[PDB]
Amino acid sequence: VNSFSGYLKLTDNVYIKNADIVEEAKKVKPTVVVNAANVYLKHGGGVAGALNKATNNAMQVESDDYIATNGPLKVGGSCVLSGHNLAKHCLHVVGPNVNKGEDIQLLKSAYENFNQHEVLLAPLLSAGIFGADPIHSLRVCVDTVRTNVYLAVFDKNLYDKLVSSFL
């Protein structure tokens, strides 16, 4: 049994809710929250900007030190950093950004990072301002992630379309 409430069960291991990921993290304090990161860990907008704002920019400060030491992530890659006030840990995962012309086949590699964690609170990777089709992102998630994933989806309209169209 875990602390996640109000989720619709899609599969053995994937659950979904219409919820603002920031508010959900603040309430649950999960072991792992996933960030929709870019390779530079520049948390300007989208999920990343919202998570970082909720940490009062401490996520960005920590991320700048990580990049100064290690250099950029790979598209499809990840790193584990602090979860600050939102979670124990933040798994920063880089899905391909379609609006930058990145290979959508890298979305599966991105989701494979989730398998290193038993339970996660996450957004749909490569969706929103990353330009991918969120329906596709949910399909790759279900077909790739084997650990227990709680997907929070901000937009009620998109949430309803993801549930209604789920095979």
Ligand X SMILES: Cc1onc(-c2ccccc2)c1C(=O)O
**Interface contacts to ligand X, rule CB under 6 A:** 21, 46-47, 50, 123-124, 127-128, 134, 153-155
Integer Cα distance of 31 and 87 in angstroms: 6
Q: Which of 94, 90, 101, 95 is nearest to 136 (CA)?
A: 95
Integer Cα distance of 141 and 151 in angstroms: 10
Integer Cα distance of 100 and 60 in angstroms: 22
* Residue 125 C-beta: closest distance to ligand X, Å: 9
* Residue 5 C-beta: closest distance to ligand X, Å: 18
Nearer to ligand X, 67 or 135 (CB): 135
* Residue 40 C-beta: closest distance to ligand X, Å: 18
* Residue 96 C-beta: closest distance to ligand X, Å: 15
Nearer to ligand X, 18 or 68 (CB): 18
Structure tokens at 99: 């609006």
Residue nearest to ligand X (CB): 128
Give the H or E element holding residue 153: strand 148-153
Nearer to ligand X, 79 or 125 (CB): 125
Nearer to ligand X, 140 or 153 (CB): 153
- Residues in the chain, overall count: 167
* Residue 21 C-beta: closest distance to ligand X, Å: 5
Nearer to ligand X, 70 or 85 (CB): 85
**With DSSP H G I counted as helix, E B as strand and the rest as coil, what are the percentages for the chain, rounded to 5?**
40, 20, 40
